[PDB]
Amino acid sequence: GTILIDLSPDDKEFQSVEEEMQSTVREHRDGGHAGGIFNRYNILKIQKVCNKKLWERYTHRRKEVSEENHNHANERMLFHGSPFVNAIIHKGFDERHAYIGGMFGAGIYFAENSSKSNQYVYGIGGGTGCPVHKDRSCYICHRQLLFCRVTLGKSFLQFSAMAHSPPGHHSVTGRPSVNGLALAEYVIYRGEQAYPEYLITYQIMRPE
Ligand SMILES: O=C(Nc1ccc(-c2nc3ccccc3c(=O)[nH]2)cc1)c1cccs1
Numbered sequence: 001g002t003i004l005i006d007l008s009p010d011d012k013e014f015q016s017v018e019e020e021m022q023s024t025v026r027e028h029r030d031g032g033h034a035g036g037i038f039n040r041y042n043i044l045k046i047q048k049v050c051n052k053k054l055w056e057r058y059t060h061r062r063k064e065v066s067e068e069n070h071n072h073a074n075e076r077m078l079f080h081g082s083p084f085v086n087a088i089i090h091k092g093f094d095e096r097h098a099y100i101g102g103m104f105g106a107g108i109y110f111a112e113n114s115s116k117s118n119q120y121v122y123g124i125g126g127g128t129g130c131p132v133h134k135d136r137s138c139y140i141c142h143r144q145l146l147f148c149r150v151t152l153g154k155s156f157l158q159f160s161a162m163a164h165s166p167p168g169h170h171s172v173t174g175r176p177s178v179n180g181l182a183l184a185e186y187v188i189y190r191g192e193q194a195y196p197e198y199l200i201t202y203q204i205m206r207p208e
Pocket residue numbers: 079080081082083096097098099100102109110111116117118120123124185186
């Protein structure tokens with residue numbers, strides 16, 4: 001039921017999605033080990049992900065959350081990197097897209113920093129890198145990330161350096177408490193609380 005619509009680079013929607021991608025790159029504490037060494041991306045394609053069933057599944061859960069939280073879904077646009085990006089766009093998020101060993105327990109993780117999600121494109125820790133060159137810092141191979149609409153509802157605040165949501169909450173927020181430059185990361189425990197809105201195809205660029 002999924003169709004992918006390509007956006008033109010001339011489209012305001014392509015440009016605002018690209019700007020979010022580029023402007024939320026940061027340096028990582030692993031020196032580039034997991035995701036590669038880069039300061040920016042070469043955006044090759046941005047597609048809108050259109051699936052009626054998956055969308056209705058998302059808005060149904062969004063209304064439930066809203067009604068449990070004074071009519072406030074607390075919806076964000078957040079990045080997601082995964083070796084399962086092609087299954088996610090066809091079948092939706094589900095407990096197979098969960099990071100079992102994540103710091104906030106087994107859930108589905110999203111990041112404000114695109115470069116954080118980039119670290120998971122080839123698996124946890126960057127796995128063994130790109131399939132072709134076995135390089136976590138490959139500048140040749142095409143990578144994909146999702147830019148997703150995510151319902152956080154009442155989010156449990158975790159200050160720090162599938163399971164259930166903490167009682168009385170719909171998500172967890174991981175607040176960075178050491179690295180002054182890191183943006184927040186978020187965890188949901190229900191696949192229905194995220195919709196994979198954009199598929200972004202890109203390369204990491206080698207610094208000059
Ligand atoms: O690599 C896997 N799953 C997986 C998918 C996404 C992430 C992920 N984790 C994050 C943690 C923090 C911030 C963003 C993310 C993010 O964008 N993605 C982690 C693990 C596997 C499970 C079973 C066989 S392979």
